[PDB]
Ligand binder design. Sequence first.
Ligand SMILES: Nc1ncnc2c1ncn2[C@@H]1O[C@H](COP(=O)(O)OP(=O)(O)OP(O)(O)=S)[C@@H](O)[C@H]1O
Ligand SMILES: Nc1ncnc2c1ncn2[C@@H]1O[C@H](COP(=O)(O)OP(=O)(O)O)[C@@H](O)[C@H]1O
Ligand SMILES: [Mg+2]
Lengths: 210, 347, 45, 56, 56, 191, 197
Amino acid sequence: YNHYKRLRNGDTSNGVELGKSNILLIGPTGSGKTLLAETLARLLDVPFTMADATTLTEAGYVGEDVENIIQKLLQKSDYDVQKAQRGIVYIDEIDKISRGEGVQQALLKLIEGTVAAVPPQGGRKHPQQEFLQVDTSKILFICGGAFAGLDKVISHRVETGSGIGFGATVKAKSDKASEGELLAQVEPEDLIKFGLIPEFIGRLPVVATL
Amino acid sequence: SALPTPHEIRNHLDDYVIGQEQAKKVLAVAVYNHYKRLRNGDTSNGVELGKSNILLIGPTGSGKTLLAETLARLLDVPFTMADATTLTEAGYVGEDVENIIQKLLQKSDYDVQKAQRGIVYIDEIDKISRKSDNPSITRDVSGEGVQQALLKLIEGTVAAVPPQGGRKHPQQEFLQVDTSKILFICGGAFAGLDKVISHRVETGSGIGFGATVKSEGELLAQVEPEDLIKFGLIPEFIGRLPVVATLNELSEEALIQILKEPKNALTKQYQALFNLEGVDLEFRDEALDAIAKKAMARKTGARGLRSIVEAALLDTMYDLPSMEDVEKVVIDESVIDGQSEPLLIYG
Amino acid sequence: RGLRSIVEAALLDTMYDLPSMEDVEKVVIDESVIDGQSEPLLIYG
Amino acid sequence: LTEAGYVGEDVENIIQKLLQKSDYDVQKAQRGIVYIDEIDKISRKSDNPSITRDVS
Amino acid sequence: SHRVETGSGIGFGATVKAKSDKASEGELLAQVEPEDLIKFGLIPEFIGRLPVVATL
Amino acid sequence: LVPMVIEQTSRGERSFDIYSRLLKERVIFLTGQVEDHMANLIVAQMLFLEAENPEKDIYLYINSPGGVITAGMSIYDTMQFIKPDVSTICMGQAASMGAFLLTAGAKGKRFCLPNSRVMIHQPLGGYQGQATDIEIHAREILKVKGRMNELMALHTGQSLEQIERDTERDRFLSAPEAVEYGLVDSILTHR
Amino acid sequence: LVPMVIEQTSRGERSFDIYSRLLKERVIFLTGQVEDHMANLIVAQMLFLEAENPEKDIYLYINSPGGVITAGMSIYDTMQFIKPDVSTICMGQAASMGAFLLTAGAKGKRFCLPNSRVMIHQPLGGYQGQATDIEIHAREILKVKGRMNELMALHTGQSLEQIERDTERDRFLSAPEAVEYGLVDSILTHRNENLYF
Ligand SMILES: Nc1ncnc2c1ncn2[C@@H]1O[C@H](COP(=O)(O)OP(=O)(O)OP(O)(O)=S)[C@@H](O)[C@H]1O
Ligand SMILES: Nc1ncnc2c1ncn2[C@@H]1O[C@H](COP(=O)(O)OP(=O)(O)O)[C@@H](O)[C@H]1O
Ligand SMILES: [Mg+2]
């Protein structure tokens, strides 16, 4: 609502620029991450595309790969720059790239906002200038992925730094209720230990946990 | 058509940046000189003005990337921002160093004559430094291989740029761009440089009896080229970058200023969001101090601030549109902690 | 190339405030300026 | 420059630049001068066996 | 194989697996999931458009 | 031999010794006779754990037939000096010094296994020399015995007189007996 | 067997020994009998720490029944030589040499644990041979006793006569007795109620 409310008032005459807030979705597999993004796109008639970070982990010509995402959105958007700029982008398996620092650096530039050149309506050959210039600053990006190791990290911090002794609470029966409450307490510090980049976390202030 | 003085440029930077005086002076002086060197394109005299490139050094969340963005707002000439981590040695599939100029052309509507007069900010330059060198007899692609390529680019040479989103190949569809007049601002958050500086300043003689025994921003302000050589930068690269500007770390007081003093301050952004919705938002001074401590405790710097505010006002922002007859919202220190909810005034 | 760095640092402050300054016709750089003990001498005319 | 088949560039490109200066007058280029800077950047890393080919 | 095989143990009680129990492509393609196809080089969205997976 | 153990971190798999892996989880072992070197090692582990995170509880496992007193007191003083609560667990047995350290743990964090066996007795000593030095050394061991009994009574909550009567000779106690004596808070029968 | 610990540095994780990790925090341990080798090791550590940071205080924990004197003098001289204030702490016990080193710490930075016990006595020695050599060795140990007593009086602030009377035979002292005798400055009963550091 907030992201689109800003687009509704693009000018917002004041001495204030409304910075975009992206979302980070944490949860297990099949918990409904992609469905939430898709359902929003159905509710709000905007183009929705889906990308996978693992495919992009190659770290070769990342600019072309990240730009392709935008190109995919334009096809669904019917090559409408205005409609495409309002689109929703969902990125999956963002945890896998963490340890690919170069991948994160390329991604955050796309998340922060940049101008991308996409060839118009395909074509055999077209001049540089003809390429459409779309801005990613106005596009909402949702990053998802399951962080299995992260749960243990939170426990090591929030709870006693144990897990091997007698007193250690390892009464784990795969209930997953403890894991859900523990992930709710997720903070940027926990993601840092998992391998994410602080710059990337700062561009994903909103953290939703399934 | 008088050019803006550095004082004017610094005033513009102050609107968005807080706490970096030396870096602001350097950038303002560099930009002013840049405009002067371009104005006298003919330069009818026996002198050719040579550019002085900048080198920004500062911890994360200090304002390096932000300073670059602010210049773009007040820069007539094309400004582009690039990342050095992608860049790879020619012949390798990662990326090439000519892509930078390509982005610059896009900002100038592919007007070569307008790009040569541009400014380029290269981020994450420290990543290229040989930190854990472990000699590269096989190859050094992400590090020393990139510095070597940039040398002529910074110094000034014609660069073959593909038309758009292409890589170099036998194809002759290349337009030549000259970087002799392009200004480069290489910014990197050098990690461990302070230790190198301290070693030089506190080298001492030995450890025995006969031997003699001897702030981050203040320590970094004593940076010399030799400190950078040991960090993994070729002497040639520093020569290309004469100027050096240090950025001190953000204190708790600075974070409080960042919340309200800037033109695009976090507090002002949310107030505008509520104001267009018909509601008034007020942040108490205690709340701002509380937010700064939370960010400092989490070691998230200024970036963390957006998250603290979003979480605090999540419940309020959810119920506010449906809520009616609500004219003002007040945030207290307790709200940031989560013990209490923000106070609402009904009219 | 080192020379460019030294000259830039010594005149960094002067270049910043020179356009704001008025009635300044000459700037003199002494040996002390390089060391940092003193500041450039400005002549007003 | 690269090793005749890789993405970077071709050595012949040099001559192309030379022709540009001579307005594509071959006879005027064949007698030209060329300066190859950063020639130390292309060198084996003190390795005679050359385990892998150095394209750059 | 990597996804669904955890290897074998070493003790007495552990179940040692020989080459004959390698579980090759025959009877191993039914367990396939979209994640395996993506690693093979297909697009995730492409798989979603083809829900039916007839295995021979 | 000490078997190595791999710990799966975020990216870098780390090889650890079986005893170092547990130390990373705030677990210390006190095995064998109590001497100065092993005691110094335990003290170093306590100090290191305190520096890392002083608000997390520490665990000390005890299987020892006892030993010198000075070393045991150093361990005891360190546990009462640091901020982290030192949870003592008895495995196998805990003699005089082991028991003094066992009962010295944080209140409510002293455990013992069901088949464990605790033993308490008066200090031991001796001297050979002139009568003057003998009289001096006798007072010292006597002062130590009185001091030890006071501390034993303070942690168990029993009467100093009762402790003195029970320490005149070797006294054995099972896990249930220790629970009713105030030595150990609770027994860990199962998980 | 000494456990190995991991330290998270800027470059990455690094493995260190427990005794070395503590040394990184300016902490030295003097355990067991005082000999030349262990004393030489302590000397090396003190010098290394002084060069690292000559302003910060060095903590030295002492749990030993004493030993050779010469080895102790080397450690003592090293402590009085370096600029850093060597904070001495008593764990378990401190015999003649241990006590001499304990009281030799920096003024106001000498601590003892509540249940520690210090012991002081005159030097021990002996020789076998001709009467001439016996007299020589006797005078030397006597000079050592005089020098040791003088230093003990200087640090504790007591009178040389009082020290001589108390060192003629084994004298035991607890933490409170040491404080009133001048061997130690204060006691360390806890970390979060004294904050002497
Ligand atoms: N001096 C400052 N004034 C105002 N806002 C600041 C300042 N420093 C940091 N910030 C805030 O922190 C955010 C991130 O700061 P950046 O300067 O972009 O980080 P950085 O300097 O690029 O460090 P890197 O690029 O991650 S190594 C900005 O978007 C601002 O909101
Ligand atoms: N809460 C839910 N309600 C309805 N369907 C769900 C829900 N959660 C998951 N699904 C089903 O799971 C699929 C999407 O799973 P998803 O969350 O995208 O997995 P992952 O998070 O691993 O990508 C959809 O086909 C959808 O039908
Ligand atoms: Mg940066």
